[PDB]
Amino acid sequence: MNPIIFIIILLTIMLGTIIVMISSHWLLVWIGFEMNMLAIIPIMMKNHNPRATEASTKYFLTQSTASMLLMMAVIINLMFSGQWTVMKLFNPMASMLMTMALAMKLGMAPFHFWVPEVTQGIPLSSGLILLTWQKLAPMSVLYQIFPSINLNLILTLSVLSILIGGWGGLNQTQLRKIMAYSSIAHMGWMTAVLPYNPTMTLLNLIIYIIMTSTMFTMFMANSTTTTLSLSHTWNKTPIMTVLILATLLSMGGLPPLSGFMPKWMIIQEMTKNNSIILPTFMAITALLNLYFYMRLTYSTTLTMFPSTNNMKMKWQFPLMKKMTFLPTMVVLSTMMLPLTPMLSVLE
Amino acid sequence: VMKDVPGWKVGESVFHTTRWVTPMMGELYGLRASEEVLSATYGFIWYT
């Protein structure tokens, strides 16, 4: 890609998301998703190979189907209320269709199958956009329509994603697939608390984005896409292994790290609503994620895996990748727990 | 026609408000011949 075109396409991805976030009209929300989907396909395809073409096609079919269902919900809503204002929907069938459409876009279980396959088939930088920035637009719609969402449907979607995400990651050696299943599980926490306190949804989304960006950036710095490749980091950039260890323990939700905060506050909000079984089930199920985060730490930082002779040639050259914002992102990913009350800015 | 339908009140509004409401096509031509109804509904759309 021409560097100027790449910039304009990146800005269009952002503009489509921004349109969804500033719109009060349902048509403009739909347009924002359409524009956003159009601009993201070229960065899935940029490396031109059958795997990237399959991922782009699987992605296109899922998102196009979800956008058709969204437009149905909008039109049904118009028929029964005569208006387009972005807010609660005025028809339960419309609410189910929009909820299902937004669940499909977020890759929530049982509409999750595309996330591991699309992420695996695209470059790390494109996967970074797919699993972080692309969550913003659908989550911002859910933030506004949650009063009319069926509680049983949304909590069922959340519980399934936490189970599927947790179990799916156990069988993975590909880093992009580990991140994909990790993403699915984290979406479940975000939607489980949405009916009770959307602010906590925003907190979880922001922190998840920060830790997810950190991990993708650290994978990109070393061009690592598999567990075994990542296991060579100790013999090249020992500092990177320590940063990876700290970030993974944070994504595992271990105190005193930043990733404990969203799980901590979601459990609080659910208990205030006399929800005890569900948060307890979620917290215990999230141990599945901790298991396969811990597995990565064993092969990356806490043990030294076998190396190769040609690795010595790498010792003579420095890292030249941008690693933009990595020092800031890693510190926020791990050291933010003492500032937890700052979540009120999101109110 | 609705003289001996139990509970029926003749000319009862379906709206809560007492404001005048413009009748729709079926309210005016509901009981009239099909030729007139066709002209009132599709005559303009179908004209040449």
Binding site: T340, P341, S344 | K9, V10, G11, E12, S13, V14, F15, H16, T17, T18, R19, W20
Partner: protein, 171 residues
């Protein structure tokens, strides 16, 4: 819900203006000048009451003014007017610009024998003012009382008592 009140078939009866649309088009410009006052009184009623049942009397006066208008054309200018609206009636679009000669004969006849002056371009599209003894409606929409606004919040903003109060945090 209640009963829609409808006027009886007899209260609706009135003498009709049973002339075709080319006749009305031909006479429209003098008709607007001559019958403006009952016409504007009727249109004010309709847009203020928003109810056809409330302006039947004014609607009947509109008909009477038009009938008297066309009785004065018949008495004095029947032949020039007939040539004029027949000229209009021939056109599929009933165009004024195809009938300027005949319009001139009719215009000169009414001015001579009735003092009628054709309003100029732009006149009949003016917003005029009408004097009506009819009382201005109070609640034309038949609105219910609006719900009471939520209790407003007033006072001085002070710091949060002991800060966030979040678990163990002291600020």
């Amino acid at each position: 819900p209640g009963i829609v009140e409808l006027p009886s078939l007899e209260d609706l009866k009135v003498q009709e203006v049973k002339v075709s649309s080319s006749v009305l088009k031909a006479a429209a410009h003098h008709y607007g000048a001559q019958c403006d006052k009952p016409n504007k009184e009727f249109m004010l009623c309709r847009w203020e009451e928003k109810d056809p049942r409330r302006c039947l009397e004014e609607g009947k006066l509109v008909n009477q003014c038009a009938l008297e208008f066309f009785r004065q054309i018949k008495r004095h200018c029947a032949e020039p007017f007939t040539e004029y609206w027949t000229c209009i009636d021939y056109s599929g679009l009933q165009l004024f610009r195809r009938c300027r000669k005949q319009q001139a004969q009719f215009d000169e006849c009414v001015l001579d024998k009735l003092g009628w002056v054709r309003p100029d371009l732009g006149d009949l599209s003016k917003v005029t003012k009408v004097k009506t003894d009819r009382p201005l409606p109070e609640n034309p929409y038949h609105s219910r009382a609006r719900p009471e606004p939520n209790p407003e919040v007033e006072g001085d903003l002070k710091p949060a008592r002991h800060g966030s109060r979040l678990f163990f945090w002291t600020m």
